[PDB]
Amino acid sequence: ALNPELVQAVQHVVIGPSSLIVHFNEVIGRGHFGCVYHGTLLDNDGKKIHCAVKSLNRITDIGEVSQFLTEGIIMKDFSHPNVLSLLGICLRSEGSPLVVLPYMKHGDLRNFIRNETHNPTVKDLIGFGLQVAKGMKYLASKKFVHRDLAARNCMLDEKFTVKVADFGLARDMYLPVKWMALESLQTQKFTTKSDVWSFGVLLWELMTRGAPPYPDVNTFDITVYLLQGRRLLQPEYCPDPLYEVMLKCWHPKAEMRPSFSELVSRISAIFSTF
Ligand SMILES: Cc1c[nH]c2ncc(-c3c[nH]c4c3CNC4=O)cc12
């Protein structure tokens, strides 16, 4: 019942069921990421690729299926070393459509840095910040606004490569007012400059090794608190030039904040001093 030219257009994103083994009997992340399962993807050469398979239970009618094909076509053009890629999509005869993602061995970045077992250095933490900045620079270059950037929404692969996630077909893996720019709190509109604000908060989470921001301020009171000029304080083991970068991200004037290219330039120079 689907439109044939749309079916043709999505072909390059479609993973055939003979290319994929899904283990619907073993979930990833104890259900905390929703209906996400271990899977094995067979590439053109027959190489076995460990993947994360999400079942899209929200899709029922043919109209929802059609919009889903588009989201897949759009996100398949989005690939960068610091952005979570889309491996492909599955259109099943019986059962919900599937989203196929690369497996992220060390899960989300917030839980990784919060874990007592892991001891990342100040340099390693700065390195994660630089990787996120690189991923965001790529997104911003394609005029893509994330809207929910935070350490909880970045993943870490087996090589400790940070991937900006929670966007496109990788969203809803389960308002973020304490990560939101002052103008987003006032207007409910999001821009790349509001993403820069959220990046600033993410850098603070990195340097505090996952501490929650403004723990004594209600989500309702955040607007007034920011209007008074109060900002997150300098973390104990945060280099002064990197705290200046964080403060730049939270400038009340969106146009005054650094671009993601500026952030990459400035943070790489800080990383290189260590
Ligand atoms: C969103 C997403 C796409 N691919 C993923 N692969 C793995 C995980 C993940 C979340 N938590 C944990 C993992 C792996 N081990 C864990 O303890 C998430 C994703």
**Is there a single domain that holds both residue 126 and residue 243?**
yes
Q: Is 23 annotated as a binding residue?
A: no
108's tokens:
């989300």
Q: From CA 236, how far away is CA 238, in angstroms rounded? A: 6
Cα distance between residue 206 and residue 113, in whole Å: 7
Tokens representing residue 250 in the block: 């939270």
- Quote the strand ranges of the chain, DSSP E: 20-27, 36-42, 48-55, 88-90, 98-102, 154-156, 162-164
Cα separation, 122 vs 239, in Å, equals 9
Whole-angstrom distance, CA of residue 126 vs CA of residue 261? 16
Read off the CATH number of the domain in which 87 is found. Answer: 3.30.200.20
Separation between Cα atoms, residue 235 and residue 134, nearest integer Å: 23
Q: Contact at 8 Å (CB) between 20 and 39? A: yes
Distance 210 CA to ligand 1 centre (A): 18
Resolution for the entry shown, Å: 1.9
Helix, strand, coil % over all residues of the chain, rounded to 5: 45, 15, 40
Residues 134, 212 contacting (CB under 8 angstroms): no
Q: Which of 22, 26, 28, when mutated, tests ligand 1's pocket best, judged by the most ligand atoms within 8 Å of its CB?
A: 28
Tell me: is residue 127 an annotated ligand-binding position.
no
Atom of ligand 1 nearest to the CA of 84: 3
- Domain containing residue 142: CATH number: 1.10.510.10
Whether 98 and 161 map to the same domain: the answer is no
Kindly state whether residues 78 and 115 are assigned to the same domain. Answer: no
- The approach used to solve this structure was X-ray
Task: Give the closest residue to 83 by CA, choosing from 150, 39, 33, 133.
Answer: 133
Rg (CA), the chain: 20
What's the burial of 200, exposed, middle or buried (CB within 10 Å: 0-12/13-18/19+)?
buried
Phi/psi at 48 (5° precision): -80, 120
Contact present, 194 and 180 (Cβ < 8 Å): yes
Residue with tokens 């090794």: 209
179 CB-near residues (< 8 Å, 6+ apart): 148, 149, 150, 197, 198, 201, 202, 213
- Residue 163 phi, psi dihedral angles, 5° rounding: -120, 125
Helix, strand or coil, per DSSP, at residue 124: helix
Kindly give the distance from the C-alpha atom of residue 107 to the centroid of ligand 1, in angstroms, as a whole number.
4
Active site (annotated) includes residue 157: no
Q: Give the DSSP letter string of 224-240.
A: HHHHTT--PPPPTT--H
Distance in angstroms (rounded) separating the CA atoms of residues 82 and 129 = 11
Looking at 85, 102, 119, the residue that finishes a domain is 102
170 Rama sector, left if φ>0, alpha if ψ -120 to 50, beta otherwise: alpha
DSSP 216: T
Instruction: Give the active site residue among 43, 108, 124, 148.
Output: 148
Residues 141 and 199 in one domain: yes
The reply, when asked if residue 209 is annotated as ligand binding, is no
Q: Judge whether 46 is annotated as a binding position.
A: no
Please state the domain count of the chain. Answer: 2
Name the residue of 23, 84, 104 whose CB sits within 8 Å of the most ligand 1 atoms, as the mutation to test its pocket.
104
CA 119 vs CA 108, 115, 132, 186: distances in Å: 16, 8, 19, 38
Range of the domain at 64: 4-102
Are 118 and 79 contained in the same domain?
Answer: no
Query: Final residue of a domain: which of 50, 83, 102?
Result: 102
Ligand 1 pocket (Cβ < 6 Å) reads 28-29, 33, 52, 101-104, 107-108, 155, 165, 170, 173
226 and 113 belong to one structural domain: yes
Residues 6+ positions from 7 with CB-CB distance below 8 Å: 69
User: How close is the Cα of 211 to the center of ligand 1, in Å?
Assistant: 21
User: Among the three residues 63, 80, 102, which one is the final residue of a domain in this structure?
Assistant: 102
In this structure, which amino acid lies at residue 41? L
253 burial type by CB count under 10 A (0-12 exposed, 13-18 middle, 19+ buried)? exposed
